């Protein structure tokens, strides 16, 4: 198990424009296109991201390319963020993947806002952190995925993904 397989499990794969859990136009492996209600706006973003006129449909290869870029972007977001980097640096490789997963789903700024959870993680108070992480819109809106990610933080194993 690794961060790419983990996020593939959590995000799936769809090759035509769809709406994510929040109603936002998305494609591929959880690639957010726009928060605009305009499908045309979403298609413009997609064409820009891929570099061709797609009319809302892409290939698996193209989806995996956006995914590589998005995982890269999540890691670089963590490393450039003054709140996330020390926590990332303090973690083991499995819990690092859990943090990348969160940033992939809700963005650098959103995760950096989890101040009390981040502190408990840096303190390696895993059960406490797990409890704190669940007191969130994140958990309430996507509880099964949040549960997997939280279990990964709690145990430092891949148990929730096998």
Swiss-Prot record:
Its EC number is 3.2.1.17. One of its GO terms (cellular component) is host cell cytoplasm. Changing residue 20 to A/N/S/T: Complete loss of enzymatic activity. Changing residue 30 to A: Almost complete loss of enzymatic activity. Optimum pH is 7.3. The gene is E. InterPro entries: Endolysin_T4_type, Glyco_hydro_24, Lysozyme-like_dom_sf, Lysozyme_dom_sf, Phage_lysozyme-like, T4-type_lysozyme. This is Endolysin.
């Amino acid at each position: 198990m690794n961060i790419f397989e983990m996020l593939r499990i959590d995000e799936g794969l769809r090759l035509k424009i769809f709406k994510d859990t929040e109603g936002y136009y998305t494609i591929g492996i959880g690639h957010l296109l726009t928060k605009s209600p305009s499908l045309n706006a979403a298609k413009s973003e997609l064409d820009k991201a891929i570099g061709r006129n797609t009319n809302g449909v892409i290939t698996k290869d193209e989806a995996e390319k956006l995914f590589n870029q998005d995982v890269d972007a999540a890691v670089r977001g963590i490393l450039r963020n003054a709140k996330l980097k020390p926590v990332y640096d303090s973690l083991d490789a499995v819990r690092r993947a859990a943090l990348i997963n969160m940033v992939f789903q809700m963005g650098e700024t959103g995760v950096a806002g989890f101040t009390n959870s981040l502190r408990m993680l840096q303190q390696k108070r895993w059960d406490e952190a797990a409890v704190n992480l669940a007191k969130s819109r994140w958990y309430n809106q996507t509880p099964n995925r949040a549960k997997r990610v939280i279990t990964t933080f709690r145990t430092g194993t891949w148990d929730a993904y096998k």
